[PDB]
């Protein structure tokens with residue numbers, strides 16, 4: 001359904017793009033969003049879909065908006081408006097200056113230092129899961145590796161039982177790619193229903209897990225409140241269950257279709273870290289936004305207080321003005337430009353954990369299964385939303401070409 005066009009929006013800027021079900025989705029989700037960068041499309045357009053909102057389509061505008069938090073606020077960062085209004089995670093729903101004090105605490109539980117505490121476990125789990133699949137000559141990558149690898153690592157860090165994964169994963173997905181059975185607000189309340197008692201129990205009897213550290217932490221010298229701890233832990237759950245999980249499938253799908261790129265990383269393994277960055281650019285998948293704090297003229301367009309604007313962190317990397325031959329994957333790309341981990345004061349705090357999970361996967365998978373392909377007659381389907389993903393990824397290979405080491 002298309003919402004009525006607001007009085008200040010001119011017709012020539014209307015482009016009815018649906019972020020939850022794009023028209024050209026069959027060609028690939030990244031390709032689907034790239035239609036917003038064709039020759040006849042303005043830098044900033046308005047879509048009547050999902051309640052009506054603006055969409056920045058070029059890296060220059062996306063970076064400018066993320067830097068100017070005075071005009072573009074994180075208080076209501078999700079579309080539709082109902083979801084953005086209910087959204088209250090910390091630090092993501094706050095603007096500086098209040099936002100800043102919470103970043104240090106989050107860094108304590110998912111930052112670089114922590115990646116060092118789980119180094120061995122991450123390595124062990126990756127090798128373990130891959131060796132188990134190797135002799136099978138086939139797998140359903142999404143459920144056999146993409147989900148269990150990053151998710152089990154997060155549950156370990158948070159001190160939560162793996163048997164709770166099905167419930168938590170379902171709730172997290174309703175906040176990014178809703179199936180219609182739950183609103184954002186209902187999904188968020190169910191997540192908080194889960195966390196509330198756990199936070200109280202760990203504030204009474206502290207442990208060394210991520211939830212215990214957040215719940216008993218301090219914010220710029222003063223005790224964190226139960227409510228603040230809940231709002232921060234909810235965000236961590238989403239990041240642990242619906243970020244790397246999706247990205248890994250986009251990357252493996254590409255490697256399955258490009259033997260040449262697989263051979264490159266096999267012959268020259270020192271290029272894996274660079275390959276990670278290039279894949280993060282080409283298969284970017286996050287797209288959230290901001291809300292206007294007042295009337296404001298932006299790049300010749302009149303914006304009104306209350307208007308929502310989607311800043312596809314995904315679009316910066318595919319912008320031909322930022323990267324030549326954007327759809328082409330080149331591991332030797334000199335200057336890989338992108339905003340896959342955000343831009344400005346809210347730069348991703350989990351990027352170190354994410355990069356380690358991606359690099360370990362690339363190295364340990366190609367070491368054991370260098371040659372693989374998409375299953376016979378399979379047509380890979382993608383899904384779009386706040387975070388985009390892959391519905392299923394059936395893979396096959398000849399065990400005779402594999403290595404058990």
Ligand code: MNR
Nearest residue numbers: 091092239240243244247313340341342346348349350354
């Ligand atoms: C479990 C931890 C996390 C993991 C894993 C993780 C993995 C990834 C990842 C992997 C492929 C994707 C791409 C990703 C992308 C992002 N991520 Mn990340 N992220 N990520 C966070 C935790 C995590 N992320 C936190 C915390 C913030 C918010 C910081 C702040 O608001 O000040 C954040 C913020 C962000 C933002 C900024 C959003 C904004 O400006 O409103 C983007 C984009």
Ligand SMILES: [K+]
Nearest residue numbers: 075084085087
């Ligand atoms: K809000």
